[PDB]
Amino acid sequence: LPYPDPSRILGAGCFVDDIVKTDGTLMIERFVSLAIDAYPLTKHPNQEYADVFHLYLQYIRKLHDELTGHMLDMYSVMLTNDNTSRYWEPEFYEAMYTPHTVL
Amino acid sequence: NFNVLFSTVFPPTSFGPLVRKIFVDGVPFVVSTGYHFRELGVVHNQDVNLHSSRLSFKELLVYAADPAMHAASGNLLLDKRTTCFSVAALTNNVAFQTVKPGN
Amino acid sequence: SKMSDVKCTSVVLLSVLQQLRVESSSKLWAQCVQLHNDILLAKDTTEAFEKMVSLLSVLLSMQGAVDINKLCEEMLDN
Amino acid sequence: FSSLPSYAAFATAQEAYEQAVANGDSEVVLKKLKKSLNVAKSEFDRDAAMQRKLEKMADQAMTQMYKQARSEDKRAKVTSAMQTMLFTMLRKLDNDALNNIINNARDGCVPLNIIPLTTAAKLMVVIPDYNTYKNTCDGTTFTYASALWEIQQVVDADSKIVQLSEISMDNSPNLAWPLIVTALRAN
Amino acid sequence: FSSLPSYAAFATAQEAYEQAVANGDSEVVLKKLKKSLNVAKSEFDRDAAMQRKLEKMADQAMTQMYKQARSEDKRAKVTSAMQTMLFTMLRKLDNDALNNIINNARDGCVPLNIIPLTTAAKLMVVIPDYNTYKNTCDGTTFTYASALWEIQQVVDADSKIVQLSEISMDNSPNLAWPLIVTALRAN
RNA sequence: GCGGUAGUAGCAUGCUAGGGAGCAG
RNA sequence: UGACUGCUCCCUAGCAUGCUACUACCG
Numbered sequence: 101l102p103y104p105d106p107s108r109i110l111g112a113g114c115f116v117d118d119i120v121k122t123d124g125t126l127m128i129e130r131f132v133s134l135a136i137d138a139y140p141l142t143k144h145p146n147q148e149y150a151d152v153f154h155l156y157l158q159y160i161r162k163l164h165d166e167l168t169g170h171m172l173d174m175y176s177v178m179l180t181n182d183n184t185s186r187y188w189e190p191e192f193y194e195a196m197y198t199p200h201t202v203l
Numbered sequence: 204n205f206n207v208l209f210s211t212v213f214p215p216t217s218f219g220p221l222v223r224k225i226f227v228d229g230v231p232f233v234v235s236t237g238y239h240f241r242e243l244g245v246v247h248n249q250d251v252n253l254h255s256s257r258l259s260f261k262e263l264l265v266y267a268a269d270p271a272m273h274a275a276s277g278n279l280l281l282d283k284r285t286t287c288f289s290v291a292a293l294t295n296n297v298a299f300q301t302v303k304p305g306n
Numbered sequence: 307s308k309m310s311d312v313k314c315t316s317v318v319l320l321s322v323l324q325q326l327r328v329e330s331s332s333k334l335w336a337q338c339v340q341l342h343n344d345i346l347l348a349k350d351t352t353e354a355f356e357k358m359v360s361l362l363s364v365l366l367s368m369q370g371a372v373d374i375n376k377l378c379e380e381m382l383d384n
Numbered sequence: 385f386s387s388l389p390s391y392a393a394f395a396t397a398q399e400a401y402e403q404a405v406a407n408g409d410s411e412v413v414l415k416k417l418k419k420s421l422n423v424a425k426s427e428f429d430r431d432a433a434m435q436r437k438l439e440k441m442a443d444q445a446m447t448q449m450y451k452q453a454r455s456e457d458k459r460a461k462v463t464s465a466m467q468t469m470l471f472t473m474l475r476k477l478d479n480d481a482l483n484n485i486i487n488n489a490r491d492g493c494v495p496l497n498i499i500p501l502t503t504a505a506k507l508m509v510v511i512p513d514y515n516t517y518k519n520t521c522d523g524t525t526f527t528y529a530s531a532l533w534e535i536q537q538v539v540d541a542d543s544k545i546v547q548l549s550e551i552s553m554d555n556s557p558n559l560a561w562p563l564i565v566t567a568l569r570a571n
Numbered sequence: 572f573s574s575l576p577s578y579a580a581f582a583t584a585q586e587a588y589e590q591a592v593a594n595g596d597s598e599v600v601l602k603k604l605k606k607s608l609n610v611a612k613s614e615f616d617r618d619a620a621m622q623r624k625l626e627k628m629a630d631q632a633m634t635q636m637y638k639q640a641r642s643e644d645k646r647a648k649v650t651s652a653m654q655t656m657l658f659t660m661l662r663k664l665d666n667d668a669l670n671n672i673i674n675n676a677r678d679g680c681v682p683l684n685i686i687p688l689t690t691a692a693k694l695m696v697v698i699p700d701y702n703t704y705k706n707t708c709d710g711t712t713f714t715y716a717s718a719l720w721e722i723q724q725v726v727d728a729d730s731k732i733v734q735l736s737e738i739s740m741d742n743s744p745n746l747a748w749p750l751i752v753t754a755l756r757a758n
Numbered sequence: 759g760c761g762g763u764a765g766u767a768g769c770a771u772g773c774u775a776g777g778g779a780g781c782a783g
Numbered sequence: 784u785g786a787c788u789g790c791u792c793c794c795u796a797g798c799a800u801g802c803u804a805c806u807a808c809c810g
Contacts, residue, residue, distance in 0.1 A: 104781090112781090114314075115305035116305065116306050117305070119459055122458070126451055126455055129792075129793055130780065133779065133791080133792060134781085136780080136781090136792070137780080171447060171450055175450065177447070178443075179447075180440075203791085216685055217682055219682055219683055220682075220683045221680045222682070222683045223673075223680045224673050231664070231666065233664075233683075233686070235683070237680065258654075260650060263653045263654070264653075266657060267653050267657065272657065272661075274684075274686070276663050278687070278693045279691045279693070280687075281697070281715065282697050283696075283703050284697060284699050284749070292695045295695070297749065299332065299728060299749070303324060304320050304321060304342065306317075306321070311476065314473070321466055322467055325463055330729070332729060333747050337498060355481065355482070358479075358482060359481050359499050359529050360499045362474075362482065362486075363495050363497075363498055364498055367495045367498075369494075374489060374490050377467055377468070378490055382468075382471045382472055382475055383471065422805065423806085425805090426766085426805060426806090429767080429768085430766090433767080433768075610807070610808060613765075613808070616765050617765075620764090620765065620766095627797095
């Protein structure tokens, strides 16, 4: 399995180009495409590397509770969490490093 | 391989497009009708017409892209910041471009 | 910890200084870009807290531009 | 669900075919009734799926709208926000040099150039009032940015070279107090 | 659907069957009550599933033909912008000093790198530091490329006018240094 | 009792296009 | 001001196939 440099994936969520990621709710697809690259760090013998993936799965959930909770206190809208929970579960990303290609 | 060695003896202002004056409906244009490569020697274009009337679309795209008319209507330039050969300055001011930090 | 809080305050300090049109004086923007690129490459929190005084003093010497009093009585350092 | 105009067909026919087994009847009547139930049942499981798709579709267009409107208030307020961010972050660092040149430049003692780090390092600040001079510097020694400088020249508004002996809560009300003090770093 | 040519049969078959429900209908006329709106309805649905396909096809040429128009209108706005260039970069050829090297040429071909070098009127010199300035552009006139040029203006990086007396050996630390000298040809 | 044919609604797959985003040399 | 390629996730519109119920004629 290939894995990146942790400082490259961590430093790609802290430094960006405005409206991009200076508000995470307006783009949660940036962090699902950065947790795909950080997945094979979960198998590393260093436990400070394996935490970079669990930090990205915990932020995608935070950015989803906010979004579905920011459109309920200003606009009386109620979003359904069906088929959204797959992005903070470590099985959508495990399927990208296993044969029998899909999509 | 021999031209590579023999081209270090000759003046550096003899290499590049070879221009000539043509007429397109009674007005003088300067266009490129060949090239002098340090490696491949002197090459001459095969379909050059000196007296034309109307320029099509495919004949305006080949006259706008050529450096023969942009570097024959601009000012002489002597740039001492670099040691590369310098041809012309296309305007009256030098542009200085910077790079911004991240967000 | 403390070396990562100085490296993120010098990214917000050259954005405040880039929105005030300090890019229009290429004798002082060439020093601010050198005090910001040098803090980011530092490896001690005693030689990066002293290029943050030179870089911050550029903003406090620009007079009217930034209302320091209002900005300090805005639920911040009093 | 309910409230749909096509709902008084999956209620009558649903109730009828239902009760119909207690009283009972020929198989013909049963088949007839079922071939009215299904005939006016598709009309319900078609108008309550189109709605089921419109009700979620509506809650998406009215979410892209919430994004195109918060991302235009996040961009029109850049200036006002990064200045607040910087000073929220400057308080948390709790430095000593950074918390001196900030308090000094709030009462008035701003610099006139960049604070140099060398050993000669000429400086020029503007003391606005006598108390700010008395607190900051005493004698030929000046404290600034948690460092010690030595005053080399004092200058009032135009070019009035003040001697250090004649600035003393006394001769002081008689000058133009925005001074321009020049100093050099120490060691 | 008010103009489909198969609405008449459907309408009549509905009337015959539906409207004649109250009237006593035997088990032999009921076939007409049933197998007359049937088949006609099938054909109508066939006459409506083809109309819906003709409509969409039609509304795929009244969109692909606005795009063929748009592009030709655009093709005529760029064809007239390159023309307005290649005729404005031509009225600028001092055709006394240019017809004097195309004529001394063996066949009329010349290198392009010697056209601005021998037939231009203005020179722009970009100078990094002061040492380079005194070996390239000293005084009000200087020689370069076997010619003589006379200085006309010295702007700097900021694009503010500098004078030939601000350029000292010791005032040099006080200028935005990429200096741009603009000179004109002499004689 | 079953098969075929033509519409209609509903669920997944693949492909072709458009849009936004992430990484690599 | 914003190059050339390759891979990949998410959303919408269209086309064909795959097990069903509904129609209706036909056996």
